[PDB]
Amino acid sequence: SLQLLNPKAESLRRDAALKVNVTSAEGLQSVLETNLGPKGTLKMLVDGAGNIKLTKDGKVLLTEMQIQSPTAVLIARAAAAQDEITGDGTTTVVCLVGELLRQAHRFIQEGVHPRIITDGFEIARKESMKFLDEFKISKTNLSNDREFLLQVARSSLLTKVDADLTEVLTPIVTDAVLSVYDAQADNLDLHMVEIMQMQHLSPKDTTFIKGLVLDHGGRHPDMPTRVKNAYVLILNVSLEYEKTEVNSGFFYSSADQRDKLAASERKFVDAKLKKIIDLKNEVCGMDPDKGFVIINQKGIDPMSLDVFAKHNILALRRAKRRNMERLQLVTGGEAQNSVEDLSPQILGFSGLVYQETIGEEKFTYVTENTDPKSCTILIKGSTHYALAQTKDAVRDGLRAVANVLKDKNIIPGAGAFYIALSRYLRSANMNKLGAKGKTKTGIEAFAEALLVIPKTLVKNSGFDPLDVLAMVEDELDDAQDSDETRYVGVDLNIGDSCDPTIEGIWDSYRVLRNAITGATGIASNLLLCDELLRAGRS
Amino acid sequence: SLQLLNPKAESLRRDAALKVNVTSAEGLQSVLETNLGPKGTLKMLVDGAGNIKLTKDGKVLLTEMQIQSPTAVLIARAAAAQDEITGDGTTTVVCLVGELLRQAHRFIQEGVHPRIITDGFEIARKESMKFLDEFKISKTNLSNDREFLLQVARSSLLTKVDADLTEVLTPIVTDAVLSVYDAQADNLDLHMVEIMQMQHLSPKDTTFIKGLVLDHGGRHPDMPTRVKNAYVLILNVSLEYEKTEVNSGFFYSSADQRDKLAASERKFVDAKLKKIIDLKNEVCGMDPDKGFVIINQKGIDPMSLDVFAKHNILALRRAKRRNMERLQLVTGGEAQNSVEDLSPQILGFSGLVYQETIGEEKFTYVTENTDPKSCTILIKGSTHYALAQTKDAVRDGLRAVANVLKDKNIIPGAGAFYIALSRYLRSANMNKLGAKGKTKTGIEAFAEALLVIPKTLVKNSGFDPLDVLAMVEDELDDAQDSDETRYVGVDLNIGDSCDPTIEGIWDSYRVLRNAITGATGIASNLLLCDELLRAGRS
Amino acid sequence: VFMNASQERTTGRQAQISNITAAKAVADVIRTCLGPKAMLKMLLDPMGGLVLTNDGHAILREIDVAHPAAKSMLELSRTQDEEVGDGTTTVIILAGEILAQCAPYLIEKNIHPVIIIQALKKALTDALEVIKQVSKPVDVENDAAMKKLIQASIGTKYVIHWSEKMCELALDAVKTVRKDFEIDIKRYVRVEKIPGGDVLDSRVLKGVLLNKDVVHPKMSRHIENPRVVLLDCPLEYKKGESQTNIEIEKEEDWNRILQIEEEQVQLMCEQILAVRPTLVITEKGVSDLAQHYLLKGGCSVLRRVKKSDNNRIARVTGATIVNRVEDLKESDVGTNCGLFKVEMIGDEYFSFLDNCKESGLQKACTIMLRGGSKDILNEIDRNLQDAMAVARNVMLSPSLSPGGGATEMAVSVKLAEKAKQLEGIQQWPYQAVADAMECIPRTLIQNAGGDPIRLLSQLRAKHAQGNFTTGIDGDKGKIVDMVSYGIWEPEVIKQQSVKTAIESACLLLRVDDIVSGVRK
Ligand SMILES: Nc1ncnc2c1ncn2[C@@H]1O[C@H](COP(=O)(O)OP(=O)(O)O)[C@@H](O)[C@H]1O
Ligand SMILES: Nc1ncnc2c1ncn2[C@@H]1O[C@H](COP(=O)(O)OP(=O)(O)O)[C@@H](O)[C@H]1O
Ligand SMILES: Nc1ncnc2c1ncn2[C@@H]1O[C@H](COP(=O)(O)OP(=O)(O)O)[C@@H](O)[C@H]1O
Numbered sequence A, B: 001s002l003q004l005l006n007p008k009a010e011s012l013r014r015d016a017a018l019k020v021n022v023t024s025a026e027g028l029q030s031v032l033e034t035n036l037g038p039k040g041t042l043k044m045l046v047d048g049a050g051n052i053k054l055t056k057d058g059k060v061l062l063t064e065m066q067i068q069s070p071t072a073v074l075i076a077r078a079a080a081a082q083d084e085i086t087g088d089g090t091t092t093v094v095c096l097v098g099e100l101l102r103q104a105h106r107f108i109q110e111g112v113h114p115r116i117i118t119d120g121f122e123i124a125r126k127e128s129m130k131f132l133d134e135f136k137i138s139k140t141n142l143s144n145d146r147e148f149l150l151q152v153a154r155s156s157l158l159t160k161v162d163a164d165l166t167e168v169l170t171p172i173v174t175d176a177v178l179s180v181y182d183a184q185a186d187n188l189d190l191h192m193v194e195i196m197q198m199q200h201l202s203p204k205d206t207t208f209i210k211g212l213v214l215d216h217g218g219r220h221p222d223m224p225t226r227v228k229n230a231y232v233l234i235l236n237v238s239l240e241y242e243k244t245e246v247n248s249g250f251f252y253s254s255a256d257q258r259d260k261l262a263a264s265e266r267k268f269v270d271a272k273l274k275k276i277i278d279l280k281n282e283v284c285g286m287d288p289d290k291g292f293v294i295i296n297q298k299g300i301d302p303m304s305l306d307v308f309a310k311h312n313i314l315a316l317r318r319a320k321r322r323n324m325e326r327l328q329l330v331t332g333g334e335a336q337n338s339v340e341d342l343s344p345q346i347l348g349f350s351g352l353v354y355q356e357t358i359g360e361e362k363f364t365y366v367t368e369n370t371d372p373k374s375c376t377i378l379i380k381g382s383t384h385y386a387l388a389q390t391k392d393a394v395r396d397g398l399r400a401v402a403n404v405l406k407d408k409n410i411i412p413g414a415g416a417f418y419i420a421l422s423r424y425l426r427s428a429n430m431n432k433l434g435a436k437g438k439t440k441t442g443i444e445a446f447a448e449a450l451l452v453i454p455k456t457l458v459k460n461s462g463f464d465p466l467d468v469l470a471m472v473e474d475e476l477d478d479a480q481d482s483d484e485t486r487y488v489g490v491d492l493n494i495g496d497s498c499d500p501t502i503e504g505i506w507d508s509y510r511v512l513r514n515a516i517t518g519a520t521g522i523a524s525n526l527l528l529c530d531e532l533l534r535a536g537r538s
Numbered sequence C: 001v002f003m004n005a006s007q008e009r010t011t012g013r014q015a016q017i018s019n020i021t022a023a024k025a026v027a028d029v030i031r032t033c034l035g036p037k038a039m040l041k042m043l044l045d046p047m048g049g050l051v052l053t054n055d056g057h058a059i060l061r062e063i064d065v066a067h068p069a070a071k072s073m074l075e076l077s078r079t080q081d082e083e084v085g086d087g088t089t090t091v092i093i094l095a096g097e098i099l100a101q102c103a104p105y106l107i108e109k110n111i112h113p114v115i116i117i118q119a120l121k122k123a124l125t126d127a128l129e130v131i132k133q134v135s136k137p138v139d140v141e142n143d144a145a146m147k148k149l150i151q152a153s154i155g156t157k158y159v160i161h162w163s164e165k166m167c168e169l170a171l172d173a174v175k176t177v178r179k180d181f182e183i184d185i186k187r188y189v190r191v192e193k194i195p196g197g198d199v200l201d202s203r204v205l206k207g208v209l210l211n212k213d214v215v216h217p218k219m220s221r222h223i224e225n226p227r228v229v230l231l232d233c234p235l236e237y238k239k240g241e242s243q244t245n246i247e248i249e250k251e252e253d254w255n256r257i258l259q260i261e262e263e264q265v266q267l268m269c270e271q272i273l274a275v276r277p278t279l280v281i282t283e284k285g286v287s288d289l290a291q292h293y294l295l296k297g298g299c300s301v302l303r304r305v306k307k308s309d310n311n312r313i314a315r316v317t318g319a320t321i322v323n324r325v326e327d328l329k330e331s332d333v334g335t336n337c338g339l340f341k342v343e344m345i346g347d348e349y350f351s352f353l354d355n356c357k358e359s360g361l362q363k364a365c366t367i368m369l370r371g372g373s374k375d376i377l378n379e380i381d382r383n384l385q386d387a388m389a390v391a392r393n394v395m396l397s398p399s400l401s402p403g404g405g406a407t408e409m410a411v412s413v414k415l416a417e418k419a420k421q422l423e424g425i426q427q428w429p430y431q432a433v434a435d436a437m438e439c440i441p442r443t444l445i446q447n448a449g450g451d452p453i454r455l456l457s458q459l460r461a462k463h464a465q466g467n468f469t470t471g472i473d474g475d476k477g478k479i480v481d482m483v484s485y486g487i488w489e490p491e492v493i494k495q496q497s498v499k500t501a502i503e504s505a506c507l508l509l510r511v512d513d514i515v516s517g518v519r520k
């Protein structure tokens, strides 16, 4: 039908479209199968020149390696979109769609329709949402348990990096997250927590700074390096020359008008500097002990830097949009943009301001605040890929622990959620459900597909995956009759079951919810498609 | 590592070689499984020369179409050995190897080694022989009943052509093995039947001839086509001019010796032909309605046809090698090469000999024998491809009915053995295990892979395989509730169980033997294959 | 040589044979894309994206056929989508059959392509009559029946499982856009997408949803009663139209030129503070200085907002499009704003504007979609356009035709019965119209897996005796009446299907020759 219409085209239908979606799914699954779990293998990506960037995140692997298949680009958007808002569960979405297609394809070969199979996944998905309410556990945030946040932070950090980096980087996240909770209980991740690159001694020397760190310092030598008590000032006004809307020549007639006019040109800068001097006169007391610093969002003229250097005022220019939205949280002051209306109330407070330089670059450190509402995480590293590995680890770790404070619940992991849904879907009475007909295998297909995830953790350790679930099955058979509510786990060190409640392995709530919802939608849409084709003008 | 030895080499190892073996088997399965059963589809092998041929046997499809993949070559070679010794069941071999690799690969992905999987197939194979020898039934072939041979032949010929042509051709198969039988020696030859390719009225207008039919006609018009009583005479030496082997030449002294030396060649022709003329009148002189025919393998001199034409002697030439054995079996004569010794005892006998002019050629028909130990089958057709289609149908149907006489045991068909063997290979209690939790994985895989044969028949008929098998497992279970051997089958007309025995469907004993043995061996060795390699000098 | 033509002139009967085969080929691509058990279609565009859908219109947008007769069949989906918004695959699959059934005659009984056209208009005139008689009216204010009417089209899509939420989502959205005749338009229906989340918590909220945040940190992130004021102009000093060139003679002029730049932005900001707004939404960009004193009154400044998103804000908040700031009054200021709040999502910031809910201008709204991925959002968004399209026809036309092929089968029976009494030369094309109308139930039986031989034979036996609402259950594949089945579709979609399909055949049947490669 397509060859007589289009003189050139490609068409697969009714057996190859199903084999393509399953073969491409099994192919992409094998890539990210080994990365899943704590003992998984690392993966570098060197594109053109040999830029090196190292991470285990499936999003970085998918959004850096170009892919030609039409199925995998939907898995790429699904794995990326789930991680872009949640920050965790990337490879879990690929494993579910990677496993649910092959687990249903065996029954498509038997002759079951794709429509009624996907009808079983949807009604089975509603059972999992009802199971999340009973499976989760309530946790009160008023206790302010720091040990509970430490265990959540080690869940994601142990997966990416080893124990040496996890132990030193875990309390860096906990100290940053401990300040997030407040009376308003409004979560703020992007403005409050930041990441900055700095090539320094080693990755292990990452330290926590309570104040806002800046990537610039004092240009002039005579300007002060260290300041004990520095009251900041925010000004979004640009103090270099302003070009002036079509204004043209300073038509000068004699030679003197020239000098006069250049002096004139400055007068605009000195009109704004005088307001700073008038502000300094109000806070002139204890001038050797105290200090003053000005932070500008736009550039400052080098002619005006000597004015600040004479009065021992520290100058910082060309700040980011985000840093201006963070100085009020750290120093406690208020922002200002113009120089007409000033007051001492808007000035912040800082207990210690010092600068340290390496090579050509220079960094400014601010800390020792009275009541800092925000902070930073200055990560140290050796190579560029070391920063990229710490970028993805801190980016995925902050989002995972932040979601625990959003809600009042937390899901235990280590296969407890998948193993619990297996017994629930395989033992629940079907008469309570509304599905009938050939929906018998759809419940078994999706229930059995969840088992492949916790044994993929075992496949990286090298043990037999089927044998380490024998005692797990025997434990739950007696746990229901023993009248003791416990949740089992999968410990890869010894190859035996464990309890995530005491070991500290946990997982966020919206990760597993959005993962199955996004995976079931993608896997269902790929099953119903029975024809592939390419056509268009080019 | 292989690139260091040979840069032009390639290697797929331990995950890419397994997908190649399974995908090539499933790809070969998906194309070739459609020919299974009576409702299967017809394939047109159109080569570059434009030769059209219809067939459903997997042997000739894979022989003409060269195989590019290395895995499917091993499966095509298995179908060759199956078709060679047996001549039936090639479609079951490729489906069993495809399903065994499918069911095995389902467990290899679960983290099971291929060694214990193949160990379970061999124990399951040996367990099937202990089930097969009890499942077979013994019948007495000494009665030589026509009803049993017809329904057994009808079961094999229905899978080649439609119903109306099968009813016309199914007596031709039963008439092929009427007189060819030996109780004591147990010798039964299949090559004695002669397949002649010719264009005539229609394929549905064929018929069986008791005696022999040759494709050579009378060269001279004077010899009589109708002969009421013929005494055959077998010749093998060539009656034409044979150059003296030792190079020689006639150097005549004068012109008078030219015709005399030409008559020297006439003397040697008359010398050997005079004994033929003396052989004719030795029996009886001036006997009407009694001819004398001569069958020679080598050529006949056209100068000598006048001698045969005067005495009313039928002479044929350029006969086949295997026909010399068929003359003495039909006519009851005796083969001779020279003409030194002749007698009436060595001569055969025939009740009717006639010729028919069909197109630009003439066919010799010899019928009405007293006790002929052989026969022939005329393959008439309306085209070129129907001859090859009916030739493959007879060559595949002759082996099914011939195996009944080679061994009296016969297995019921209609998927009865595959359905009954599934339950027996479920639970091997303490009979043959070998190890704990290792061999049983292969027992389950082998039991589930055998049930694809009745499901493939249902997929060709256009019904649901799970629904029609639900009543079937059920029928067998209810049968068990009575301790009785009720063999159940699969009826493709209405989609319901039926008795294979009562209805009329059987399979040969040697088909299932070599099919399960050949499929298990190829399925085992392909699972053991972990790496594919190529190397050579272009 | 002669003019740029005569390469291979397909003339005579073979030209029309290729068109019927080409028109039939378009329907064969989407033959399986009909009914409740319809299969999906992933098409690969050459730019790099992907379109996952089963709608015949969205499939035929991406395909490209190098044949002129098939392209006329390609344009029929735009006729159906930009008229109602539902039944595009029904239009393509019916016409194929009409061109195909008429073909036997064209090829063999030699009826000229004009006599078939005259036969079809009388069939078209009779088709509207029986479709008018078979349809029953329905009350427009009944919300219980309206939910079942909206979910008739959703049943043939992926979100039938969430049909309990989509009908409530679509019904609230249609009543918001509906103006108190009863004209509505989808240009204000905002199709903004949010990747990720669960479909259950997804809900419509009265108002708009921006992709941007406030500029200054001190802006109030939670206002009880916002007062929105729309601005078009730059709030910053601008160069100006004519050739200007200030010439400066004295030293006290350049600082004056830079000082009036500060005073002009003060003058436009101070007159905005005469009404004291809480939120100032500017179309073009904003300066760092004007924003500073917009702050010295209590306003809130945003980035540049495109025009589209301001015309929706004008109908939500009741404000007017304002460019001249000197003419700003208190009457044109937006009011009755419910709530202001900004949520944190990793993609981008999102500012929420809620309405107080308590005639005048029609109100706009934004429908929140929380899918699984990007393709799931685009899949669900087209379902809302197909679902909300059904809600317009019942308001414009209170008639309601039966679904499940019962309407088209009713056309098949009456045209077949009346063909005997229509004795003449028009009888053969007139009788062939019923042969194609009985195929749109035949496609449902093929997708369901049943045998259409005995079902259609049982259908015609019960259609004359039983009732006019008989049809085929697509899920079970048995004959079930539409009254008990409880699924109904509008009658307007049936009219466009019969009109567009027959009118397409009248165009293509007049094609005599095909000559390609003339000029640009
Ligand atoms: N040390 C551990 N012990 C047991 N299970 C773990 C451990 N670390 C990670 N996991 C499990 O691995 C799974 C994936 O973790 P994570 O890397 O955060 O998500 P993703 O792999 O999808 O990016 C989680 O379900 C978690 O339970
Ligand atoms: N009429 C029939 N009804 C049911 N099953 C049949 C029938 N004829 C053949 N079969 C099944 O088909 C299988 C293969 O038979 P056949 O097609 O003759 O060999 P091949 O597949 O090699 O051509 C047999 O095992 C038999 O059970
Ligand atoms: N549940 C159903 N059972 C039987 N037929 C249906 C059902 N739903 C829709 N149909 C039929 O499918 C046709 C197209 O409906 P729909 O799929 O909503 O439009 P589109 O073809 O634009 O996707 C209608 O003419 C109707 O007769």
Ligand SMILES: [Mg+2]
Pocket (backbone or CB within 6 Å): A088, A089, A156, A159, A396
């Ligand atoms: Mg993670």
Ligand SMILES: [Mg+2]
Pocket (backbone or CB within 6 Å): B088, B089, B156, B159, B396
């Ligand atoms: Mg056979």
Ligand SMILES: [Mg+2]
Pocket (backbone or CB within 6 Å): C086, C087, C153, C156, C386
């Ligand atoms: Mg629709």
